[PDB]
């Protein structure tokens, strides 16, 4: 069950136990819905060959620039807008090439999703009609694959794809998991990161209360964005930022610790990068124990995987063709398994 | 009592100044820290260092390595280099200002064309991220040779 906050889920679970289901329900500790992203562009132009060895797909991935995901989520551009207007918007706002901006194919996972797919392919090497049929296949295959993501099967944000040349597309393809698989390994080569939701904190209260807010946010890995008086009142309003997973219990702790009376609002603000690298095999977290500042992403992704029932580690061999897997293992682009 | 009053008032004022001031010119903030560091308690100093490290990491993450080359990250992080924490300054760390700088340098090296020239600030970034002793802890040579 996914909901907005502590009071929201308290009301929901009350209505589940007493109002609708009318029984006793075991309820877990609360956790957050994660997201995925990349921070470095793809170094190896990754390719995939069909099970019948007819078609081949070659591409790379890249982090998006700041503001594209928020503008596409708000609705500055649409996948149903005219392509000339879409290209004009990207070229004007983000300094984008006209060819690339016209070559933007896909918004994923949905029409207003935060991932984009563009072909850098050359018409001199790719015939457009076969490119059109396999393009619709890539539309829906990329849409299928971008809900999951490789790290913890949580949807991926802030991603650009560039379909590179040489990839040839003969007729007919009924399988989807293959270019899903090369998108996943392309993420691994893009060296992904995990993203957590952020609450904007906003409290109102006296000055002893603002001092206690600074203290409690310091313990709970948040920070104070702004801090001011409210004109005409003896009140002070303090805005800040905190993760949801660290804000569980934040309101109750603040209200029972402040000597005045502080009133707290926790709203969803944005997705931010969780500290740590999710693929660092060195970082180990003890059971029952607080994650360190460096092992936090690793701890989150392992426990998400074990909660969902996935394998204990990311499987590059499962996420690759054996030939290209062995070739990249020989080349040393990937680490030791 | 004086220590806690100084903590509350002075650390709140220093955090407000750190939030208001520009990241690219840390000389006045460093001068304020050097002047008031005699009476500054350890808790207030740690909180102010955390705020400065957060501002520097935010600037390093937001600044485009290929495009926004006007504000040099090395020159921006030079003023707070001696007061930076070990966890942030550790290049081997997964998260930190030094880790973000190394990742940005690796990304710029991977997506850098020969026509644009060398990456600005990469020399001081490699000087910061190059360990004096230890082959396994040197994150400068391997990332450079791989990117």
């Amino acid at each position: 069950i996914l909901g907005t906050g502590e009071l929201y889920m308290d009301c929901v679970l009350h209505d589940l136990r007493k109002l609708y289901a009318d029984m006793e329900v075991r309820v877990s500790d609360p956790v957050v819905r994660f997201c995925e992203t990349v921070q470095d562009m793809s170094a190896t132009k990754c390719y995939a060959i069909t099970p019948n060895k007819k078609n081949t797909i070659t591409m790379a991935a890249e982090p998006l620039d700041d503001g594209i995901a928020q503008d596409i989520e708000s609705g500055a551009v649409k996948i149903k807008d005219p392509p000339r207007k879409v290209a004009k918007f990207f070229e004007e706002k983000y300094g984008w090439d006209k060819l690339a901006a016209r070559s933007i194919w896909a918004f994923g996972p949905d029409e207003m999703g935060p991932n984009i797919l563009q072909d850098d392919t050359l018409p001199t090497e790719v015939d457009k009609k076969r490119l059109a049929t396999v393009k619709e296949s890539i539309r829906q295959g990329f849409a299928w694959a971008t809900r999951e993501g490789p790290l913890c099967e949580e949807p991926i944000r802030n991603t650009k794809f560039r379909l590179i040349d040489v990839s040839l597309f003969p007729w007919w393809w009924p399988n989807y998991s293959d270019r899903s698989t090369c998108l996943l390994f392309l993420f691994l080569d893009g060296l992904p990161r995990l993203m957590e939701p952020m609450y904007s904190v906003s409290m109102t209260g006296p000055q002893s209360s603002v001092s206690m807010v600074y203290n409690i946010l310091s313990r709970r890995r948040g920070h104070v964005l702004s801090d001011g008086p409210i004109a005409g009142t003896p009140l002070y309003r303090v805005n800040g930022l905190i993760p949801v997973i660290d804000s569980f219990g934040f309101e109750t702790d603040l209200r029972i610790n402040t000597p005045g009376q502080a009133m707290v609002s926790l709203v969803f603000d944005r997705w931010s990068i969780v500290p740590g690298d999710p693929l660092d095999r060195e970082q180990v977290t003890r059971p029952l124990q607080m994650a360190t500042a460096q092992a936090t992403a690793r701890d989150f992704v392992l426990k998400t995987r074990r909660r969902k029932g996935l394998s204990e580690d990311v499987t590059v061999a499962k996420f690759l063709e054996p030939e290209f897997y062995q070739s990249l293992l020989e080349s040393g682009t990937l680490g030791e398994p | 009592p004086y220590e806690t009053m100084m903590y509350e008032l002075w650390l709140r004022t220093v955090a407000a100044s750190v939030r208001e001031w520009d990241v690219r010119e840390p000389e006045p903030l460093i001068a304020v820290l050097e002047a008031w560091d005699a009476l500054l308690p350890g808790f207030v100093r740690a909180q102010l260092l955390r705020d400065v490290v957060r501002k520097l990491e935010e600037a390093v993450e937001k600044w485009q390595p290929r495009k926004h080359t006007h504000n040099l990250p090395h020159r921006w992080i030079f003023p707070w280099l001696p007061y930076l924490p070990a966890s942030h300054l550790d290049a081997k760390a997964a998260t930190g200002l030094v880790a973000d700088v190394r990742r940005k340098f690796r990304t710029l090296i991977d997506a850098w064309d020969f026509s644009r020239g060398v990456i600005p600030g990469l020399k001081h970034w490699k000087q910061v991220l190059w360990p004096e002793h230890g082959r396994s802890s040197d994150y400068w040579t391997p990332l450079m040779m791989n990117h």
């Binding site: - | 009592p1 806690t4 740690a46």
Partner: peptide, 28 residues
């Protein structure tokens, strides 16, 4: 210094300032 600053036990709980008139009255 940073460990004692960031330590939730080591970050001390605060209390308010004194009264100078009360201190002078106590001395008198």
């Amino acid at each position: 210094d940073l460990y004692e600053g960031r330590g939730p036990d080591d970050i001390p709980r605060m209390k308010p300032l004194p009264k100078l008139g009360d201190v002078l009255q106590r001395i008198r």
